[PDB]
Amino acid sequence: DAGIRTLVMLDEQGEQLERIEEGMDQINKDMKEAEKNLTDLGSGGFIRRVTNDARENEMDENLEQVSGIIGNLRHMALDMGNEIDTQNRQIDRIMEKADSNKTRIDEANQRATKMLG
Amino acid sequence: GMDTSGKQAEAMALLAEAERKVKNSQSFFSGLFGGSSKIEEACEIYARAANMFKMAKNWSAAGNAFCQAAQLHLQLQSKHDAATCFVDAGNAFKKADPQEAINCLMRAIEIYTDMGRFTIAAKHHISIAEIYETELVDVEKAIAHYEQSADYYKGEESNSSANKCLLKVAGYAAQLEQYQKAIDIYEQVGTSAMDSPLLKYSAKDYFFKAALCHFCIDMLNAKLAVQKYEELFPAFSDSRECKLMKKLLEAHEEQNVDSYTESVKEYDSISRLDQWLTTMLLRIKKT
Amino acid sequence: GMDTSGKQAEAMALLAEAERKVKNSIEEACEIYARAANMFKMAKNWSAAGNAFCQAAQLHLQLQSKHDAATCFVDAGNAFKKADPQEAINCLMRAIEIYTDMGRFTIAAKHHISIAEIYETELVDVEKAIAHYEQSADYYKGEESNSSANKCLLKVAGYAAQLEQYQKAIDIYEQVGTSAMDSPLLKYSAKDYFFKAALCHFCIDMLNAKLAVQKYEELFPAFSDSRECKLMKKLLEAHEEQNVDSYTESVKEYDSISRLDQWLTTMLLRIKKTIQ
Amino acid sequence: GMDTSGKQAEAMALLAEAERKVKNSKIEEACEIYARAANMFKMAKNWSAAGNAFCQAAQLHLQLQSKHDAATCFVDAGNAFKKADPQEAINCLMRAIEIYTDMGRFTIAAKHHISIAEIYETELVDVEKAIAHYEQSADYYKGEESNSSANKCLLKVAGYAAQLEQYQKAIDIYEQVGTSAMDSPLLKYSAKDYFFKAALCHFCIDMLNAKLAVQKYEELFPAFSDSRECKLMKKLLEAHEEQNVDSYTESVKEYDSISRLDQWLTTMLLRIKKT
Amino acid sequence: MFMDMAMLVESQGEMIDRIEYNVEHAVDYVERAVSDTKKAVKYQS
Amino acid sequence: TRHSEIIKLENSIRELHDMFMDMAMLVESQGEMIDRIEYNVEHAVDYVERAVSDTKKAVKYQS
């Protein structure tokens, strides 16, 4: 249950991450346009039967259950990785964009003071 | 605690300074027309007073100061920071009175949506729905706010986000003793998640919920519906859901109360059950 | 080698330039000092680098700037944190005050966490560290960040139980467990917290622990089903019978069943010390 | 494949147009058009010519008044040369790293240190300069409080030292990292694994000290007893008392039956076994 | 391990939501400033 | 049969734990990176807000 909840909420986070990436691209384009305009302004068994009693039987099945579930768990876990793995790259990318943004405005500010004097 | 008294005293002094500044601002405007600097400066003074009151743990004073700042700055025709101040006032009132927060957030939502800022409006609608649910038993207000926020998010092209609002609305409808709406929402969410590579695993559970809420309307139609689900997601057979549902149907076919109770107890023993499932089971047991 | 000496000489030249420029009597001096501090950091001179950062921050604050001045103060504090705890503490306090004035309460809470961490790990300090943790938890709660607040409250409860009485720990564990009862993800840990509460009472006296565990069992039946219920019942019986042999046997069996974190065993030993 | 020839011709024509324009206030346009020509060559997939055009564009940008974009162009030129004469790529990445460090952005400088070290060690056989680069990256990252990447670099250099028979540095790094992980609630479960590897390396110095080292690790980290790896290590240590090859061979085969041992782990296991 | 990861991922989610809110304010004010600059430049000419 | 299933389950759990530790380290790195990016963007937005306010007041004073 916890695995499933984590996977679904991570999917939601990934969609949000794509949305914010789009927003960051919009920010970059809008700020570039504004700066340009401003510049243009200027399995067989699991338990041996020590005793032939019912208590042994279910054990096997019980164990089997867990085994099978672990199989399922495998895919679950693997799936998670994939999602986060992709997200990793995205974050790195935005870094560079962000950098450029601030860099530009920096000199822009200087311009706003250089021409006035 | 000298800290609390000192913070309260300094906040009150700064608020009085703001009040006298706004008072003589009109005199200056009438006499010499200093400009709009006096109004903005009083706005920052009011914001600082609100922050200091919050640091003094007097939420009511902070909210009042935020309201005065909002009004004063809105008089300057600046609506964005006015709505920000209404949001601050609502946050302040949250601890003191949860009612003024409602109207403050309504005004903030109106201001935000005037400019098309639907994200903040939808988030405030969700917050107001949560406040209504926590405070008032009137689930209708929460439903209305949640569906409004979900519509806004759908208009915002935000996938997998309004789905949570739809799920919450379905849960509220099921709790409110109205089943068809909740069943429809549950089945829609499940079939949508079917095509989702990740949510498909969870999708099956949603079907069960629908079936569960479809079991209150009438027994047989639910059982039949299971086949419609069963063919749709054959792996649903591997899950314990099919066994549980069929066993409950078999037990209810002959009024076998003891078998029903034993199965419910064992299933809870495997893992703890939620209040929703317990209420559904109790209601079904009435028959 | 050559690198360190050359970078140190360049930093000295930058400081001399800034000093003479200010003597000529403003920001350009601030950037010169910042570059000199970066030069010192590149030279690995922890000393005279955080001081340069602090001087640059003060020079830039001279014209009422707070944002970048606060950032430079925080940089100086982090630089001196490894070299000199006191200077880092002063810088972090300055940053906390500036950001509280400006309203960046999250930054203030983060700096309080850093101060408490250095006080516990670097310095020998518990009371001030506990106060800083409490302040940071309150700030985060105000900023709708309850996870860190709960973590800090649990840490403070553990420390108080370790050195002080358990009443504070009792209250903290009880409130945290009650809050987590409805929480779907934190529900399972809630019982554990409830369990801890019982232990906190057992150290004080048997009757209080008995009443508390009975109240939890009545209120939260699930706690009964856990192995902790059986373990606590057995320990209660051992203490009531004034036969420390049974207490020791139960403790060894419980340790064998699952590993220990060295804290539960210590608390159980302390309880065994008061069994008489 | 006529597309490659068409792209090459178009890029050459663009470069000729850029040269005429610059030859004809004009510094900014000249630099921009040179950068566009370099990007066009890169699009044409002529790695050598694209890299040369981009590096001359970077030089002309330096002729223009700018530093941050100059550093970006230097790092981009290094990436372009990545698939060219490695010396120019390495030198341009050194220049970009120095510029970034001068600007105070140490994290990106250390990331570029890691990049240069990896590309150099994977391509060229010499390892010493790569280890030096990794150490420098770890120094910057730790100075900036970037624990994760600095620890990764420390682990990499420790592994290389162990491969190089300098087991002392590797064991020291592994021990310090593992005890630090013990201090932190997180990553402790994995840290013991490091100890295991370290423990193996420890035997390389001698035999009799292995018992003392495992005892010290056990008393330092009692839960390390539960590790099946410690059980395997002690079984092999006891088996080595006699000159028998069947014992440890069967032991390693059985353990491999569970998970496939790393190639370096198998190599060091064979090394310890033979002598 | 799963429980710890769950808590960490929830904390990351709240972090991301806060960053989204900050970016939303940033873009709102960026758009407002863009409109103001466009009006100013158009009218000044 | 016993050995096949036991070692199969051991391999499955070992691989699970390995990828989980890898993902936890990656998640910690991601958390540090996002904390940095949030700090950077907050500083950038504050700086641009201050710059635009300064420019607006300057132009109002001059016009």
Numbering used by the authors:
A (entry chain H): 41 to 82, 130 to 204
B (entry chain J): 0 to 286
C (entry chain K): 0 to 24, 38 to 288
D (entry chain L): 0 to 23, 36 to 286
E (entry chain G): 215 to 259
F (entry chain I): 197 to 259
Copy out sentences from the published article reporting this entry, exactly as the authors wrote them.
The membrane-anchored SNARE (soluble N-ethylmaleimide-sensitive factor acceptor protein receptor) proteins provide the energy to drive membrane fusion in various cellular contexts, such as intracellular trafficking and exocytosis. Supercomplexes of NSF, α-SNAP, and either a syntaxin tetramer or one of two binary complexes of syntaxin—SNAP-25 reveal atomic details of SNARE processing and show how sequential ATP hydrolysis drives disassembly. NSF comprises three structured domains connected by flexible linkers—the adapter N-domain followed by the D1 and D2 AAA+ domains. Six NSF protomers come together to form the active form of the enzyme, a homo-hexamer.
To gain insight into the structural nature of binary complex formation and disassembly by NSF, we prepared a complex of NSF, ɑ-SNAP, and the binary t-SNARE complex (21bin20S) composed of full-length soluble SNAP-25 and soluble syntaxin-1a (1–267) in the absence of divalent cation (i.e., non-hydrolyzing conditions) and performed single-particle cryo-EM. First, models of the NSF D1 and D2 domains with substrate bound in the D1 pore were built into two high-resolution (2.88 Å, 2.92 Å) classes from a single dataset, differing only in the state of F protomer engagement with substrate. Next, the dataset from which they were derived was combined with two additional datasets to enable the 3D reconstruction of weakly populated states with ordered density for the ɑ-SNAP—SNARE spire. Classes with evidence of NSF D1 domains engaging ordered ɑ-SNAP—SNARE sub-complexes were carried forward; eight 21bin20S models were built into reconstructions ranging from 3.39–4.01 Å in resolution, differing mainly in the orientation of N domains and a sub-complex of three ɑ-SNAP molecules and four SNARE motifs relative to the D1 ATPase ring. All classes revealed substrate-bound NSF without Mg2+ needed for ATP hydrolysis and disassembly, and share the same overall architecture, with a spire composed of NSF N-domains and the ɑ-SNAP—SNARE subcomplex on top, the NSF D1 ring in the middle tier, and the NSF D2 ring forming the bottom tier. As such, the stoichiometry of the syntaxin—SNAP-25 complex observed is 2:1, the dominant species in solution. Three ɑ-SNAP molecules bind the 2:1 binary SNARE complex; a flexible linker between SNAP-25 SN1 and SN2 blocks access by a fourth. Of the eight 21bin20S classes with the 2:1 binary SNARE complex from the dataset collected under non-hydrolyzing conditions, six engage syntaxin and two engage SNAP-25 within the pore of the D1 ring. Docking the 2:1 binary complex structure back into the seven individual 21bin20S reconstructions reveals an apparent preference for syntaxin, with six of eight reconstructions featuring the N-terminus of syntaxin H3 bound within the pore of the D1 ring. Taken together, we observe that the NSF D1 ring can bind to at least two different SNAREs, syntaxin, and SNAP-25, in various configurations.
